[PDB]
Design a protein around this ligand. Structure first.
Ligand code: HEM
Ligand SMILES: C[C@]12CC[C@H]3[C@@H](CCC4=CC(=O)CC[C@@]43C)[C@@H]1CC[C@@H]2C(=O)CO
Lengths: 463, 193
């Protein structure tokens, strides 16, 4: 019995009342909770009345695995209209995230070696580590000025600035001077534009351009002006490095984009568009998981002490060779795995399937929109015993970890992101105890990225 | 819905508060303990000022000192009260720092406006001034509460074996309820500048 598509349960949602509820609330902050309860109601697969085209929502490793077996040579995601629209309006090309087909593959293969490959990590990870050491030094100096050898603060601003700085050094070889100092205005303008770009993305992504162009034209100008600001920021970084390399081609590693420009395999215009993706995508995606981990570690001091144990043991060798932090802190890497299971920045994986396939023994025809919701996936009590528990051992004992996606489209920035998170934690863990009174669950909110709605007050006590 | 600190209390709620505040705020015993902390900030004021003075060719600086004195007192009191060092002496005013100085000044002005007439009358004669006054207090309470939430959470986890300030003593002893401590801590924070 391979049951026909229609057999599959249907979402009780009306495509139209959803558009209207998004128009009204100016967002969809509860998307993750809705999809979750629907999965509790109707089992691990269901279909959404999209008005003709075929959407299917899953949440099992089982299903993701099959899905990787039907990635074409050109795995395809759905056009994100608002982002592409802006590109075409200002006459830019599209980077890897907004491409499909031949052009995607041509870009991707000329990007993996310098952004994602192990040989690239080895070169940029020391630079990241330099910024992470600086983050903790700056924090230690503040802490030691206090009589109780501790500082209690909302760490979100300084963690966001660390990701800006670490990403910038890795990407462009420049030190912006945003760790252990104040935010610049260019810094805050950039963070603000990212926030607004994301907010407006939700508004415009859930109704065709057809209607949005006249229903919410103010949302369009808002989205474009946010992108204008983001591009202004990213272009200035590009203008700098471009001018510097035109006069001197260095003999030592000075970051990822340099490698791209040096090789000149991609066109400048294609390099420009991919740098903007890396520059824009390297801030919030990383900052938030990092904050959630600090929060979880502060609620679970026993787990924190275990993670401290190993970071102190490896302290020695890592400062000699930073590159070994990947291999030598496997319990800390498990913690990240654990943070992204409970709080996945990318809420759902997405494929418009090029062939027909079978999931949960239902027939899924080609051209179907298939969405894996990692929030519900991560919380399946079956695959994850004691799902609510924050237990990195869970990972040492063992498609259960796919918060970065899968196959050839999987996150291009994965190794950078993981370096940035791992190194900051490691250096913090050698030097500080992290504590909070605010032990209650933080409510996640969905604005394209899935992010904490609240920022708890964390105490950093020097050891 | 906040409690009143010792300044605004009369009667036995007052006496209860006062007798649980004299020892750590006013006594010579408490002064022996915070005076060295205050000395540090004073020393720092004088060094920061000297660095600037010696950069000048006549070996003097000529300025309106008011801003830097106000930042000295904010720093001194915050160290004495909460045992934290704000970084305001020898550096530029932070924006929390300036908002607080402004909020205080507006709170004092509006006080005089509303002070000499009953609420029954001032309600409709000067309602925009009640708004100003309450906004000033919101900002003051915002600043004072940031301070206290920091110390509270620090002291719930570790009781230091040494002196880390006046409000630390009150919280350690916990003779007054939290709400009472918060109320009195606001008066010392607002009143110490
Ligand atoms: C913890 C942080 C991050 C998470 C959880 C994350 C997650 C993801 C996910 C789920 C995808 C979709 C993969 C798929 O469709 O199979 C993706 C793609 C992508 N990510 Fe990330 N990401 C993170 C950080 C970053 C960073 C820092 C960058 C840039 C440096 C980045 C750049 C990209 C790009 C360019 C793609 C598109 C790749 C393609 O379509 O071929 N990501 N990421
Ligand atoms: C992770 C994500 C895909 C990758 C992007 C990220 C948001 C920030 C971002 C900006 C870019 O210019 C490049 C891709 C990227 C890093 C998205 C948020 C949700 C989405 C997904 O959930 C993918 O399945």
């Amino acid at each position: 019995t391979v049951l026909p598509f229609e057999a599959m349960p249907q979402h009780p949602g009306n495509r139209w009342l959803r558009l209207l509820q998004i128009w009204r609330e100016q967002g969809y902050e509860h998307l993750h909770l809705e999809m979750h309860q629907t999965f509790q109601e109707l089992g691990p697969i269901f279909r959404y009345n999209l008005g003709g085209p075929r959407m299917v929502c899953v949440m099992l490793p089982e299903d993701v695995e099959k899905l990787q077996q039907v990635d074409s040579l050109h795995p395809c995601r759905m056009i994100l209209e608002p982002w592409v629209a802006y590109r075409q309006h200002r006459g830019h090309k599209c980077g890897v995230f907004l491409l499909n087909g031949p052009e995607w593959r041509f870009n991707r293969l000329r990007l993996n070696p310098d952004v994602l490959s192990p040989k690239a990590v080895q070169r940029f990870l020391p630079m990241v580590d330099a910024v992470a050491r600086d983050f903790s030094q700056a924090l230690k100096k503040k802490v030691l000025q206090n009589a109780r050898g501790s500082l209690t603060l909302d760490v979100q601003p300084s963690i966001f600035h660390y990701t800006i700085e670490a990403s910038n050094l890795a990407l462009f070889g420049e030190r912006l001077g945003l760790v252990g100092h104040s935010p610049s205005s260019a810094s805050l303008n950039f963070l603000h534009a990212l926030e607004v770009m994301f907010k407006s993305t939700v508004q415009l992504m859930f109704m065709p351009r057809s209607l949005s162009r006249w229903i919410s034209p103010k949302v369009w100008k808002e989205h474009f002006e946010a992108w204008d600001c983001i591009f202004q920021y990213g272009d200035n970084c590009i203008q700098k490095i471009y001018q510097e390399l035109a006069f001197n081609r260095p003999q030592h590693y000075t970051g990822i984009v340099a490698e791209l420009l040096l090789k000149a395999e991609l066109s400048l215009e294609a390099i420009k568009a991919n740098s903007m993706e890396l520059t824009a995508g390297s801030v919030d995606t990383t900052a938030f998981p990092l904050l959630m981990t600090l929060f979880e570690l502060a609620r679970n001091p026993d787990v924190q002490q275990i993670l401290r144990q190993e970071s102190l043991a490896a302290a020695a060798s890592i400062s000699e060779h930073p590159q070994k932090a990947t291999t030598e802190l496997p319990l800390l890497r498990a913690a990240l795995k654990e943070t992204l299971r409970l709080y996945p920045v990318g809420l759902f994986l997405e494929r418009v399937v090029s062939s027909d396939l079978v999931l949960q023994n239902y027939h899924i025809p080609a051209g179907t929109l298939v969405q894996v919701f990692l929030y519900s996936l991560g919380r399946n009590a079956a695959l994850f015993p004691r799902p609510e528990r924050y237990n990195p051992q869970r990972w040492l004992d063992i498609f259960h970890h796919v918060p970065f996606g899968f196959g050839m489209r999987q996150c291009l920035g994965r190794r950078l992101a993981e370096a940035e998170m791992l190194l900051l934690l490691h250096h913090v863990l050698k030097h500080f105890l992290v504590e909070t009174l605010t032990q209650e669950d933080i409510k996640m909110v969905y604005s394209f990225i899935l992010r904490p709605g609240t920022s708890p007050l964390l105490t950093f006590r020097a050891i």
